[PDB]
Design a protein around this ligand. Sequence first.
Ligand SMILES: Nc1nc2c(ncn2[C@@H]2O[C@H](COP(=O)(O)OP(=O)(O)OP(O)(O)=S)[C@@H](O)[C@H]2O)c(=O)[nH]1
Ligand SMILES: [Mg+2]
Length: 310
Amino acid sequence: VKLLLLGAGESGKSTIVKQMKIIHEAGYSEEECKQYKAVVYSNTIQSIIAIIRAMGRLKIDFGDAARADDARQLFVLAGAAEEGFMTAELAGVIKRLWKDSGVQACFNRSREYQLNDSAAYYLNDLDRIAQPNYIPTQQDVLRTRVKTTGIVETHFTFKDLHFKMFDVGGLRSERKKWIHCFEGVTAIIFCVALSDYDLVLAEDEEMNRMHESMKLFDSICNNKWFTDTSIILFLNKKDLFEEKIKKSPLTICYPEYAGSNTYEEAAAYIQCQFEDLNKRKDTKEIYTHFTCATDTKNVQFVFDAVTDVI
Ligand SMILES: Nc1nc2c(ncn2[C@@H]2O[C@H](COP(=O)(O)OP(=O)(O)OP(O)(O)=S)[C@@H](O)[C@H]2O)c(=O)[nH]1
Ligand SMILES: [Mg+2]
């Protein structure tokens, strides 16, 4: 069974691949967890730095003036983290910064810049991750963000079927590599980030993230090469969408949306926008699922349901 994961950048494709390891195998070993330690620290320092860069660009001041010296020390200290090291000194500098009112206000305006989804997860848990002899947990691994370049091939057995799952990069530079994967595809799992409706592309600040997705899906879904391939649509990041819909208008993306700022109502609407792109509704089926890629139980039951359809 050959499965292919497609979608724009940061839509959740690689996190689903990790889930297969945890569910069909036995999770990451201690040696493998320790390999992600430097990425966790790397992901965390980059996020605090991104918020600080933005405060200058957005003209936002710190809440307490004493933070300016912590922001000085951060850069003096920053380089050890990359090497998988986090002193109780660097930890306090980051912590005091993350807690600053000015920093927080900037954190709350992240759609104006580029910030990792897992910034809060890590930054809100510094005590644990800066610990002496810290080893990344299964959730810490799933939360790491590393751009995919090239093609990754993963194998696993499930219900007597041997899967060969392919994963590629969704950023614009990597899309030219999707065609090498187009052969013998049993099923395509197209990942779409529900929470991307109010953000812009990292590759272009003038392009809305959700519209980009619509373009990709319309193209893949309606490709004649895929007539006999199963199209599974994962409306991912349902957990972030749920919190986002409450304070960010969906009219930023879909100006004609007349419904309310609610999850069930707003979710079905995005579902219909995507399923609407299917040009041969009577002869072509799309199997849609709302997901939280970082939630093992959620992915388990969804993947279980997906393979039954296969
Ligand atoms: N909270 C939350 N975070 C998620 C979810 N799915 C993925 N993430 C986070 O989004 C980030 C990007 O996911 P990732 O799997 O790297 O995207 P990708 O599609 O593989 O991206 P690319 O390789 O084309 S650049 C990761 O830090 C990951 O933990 C989700 O449903 N909820
Ligand atoms: Mg990836």
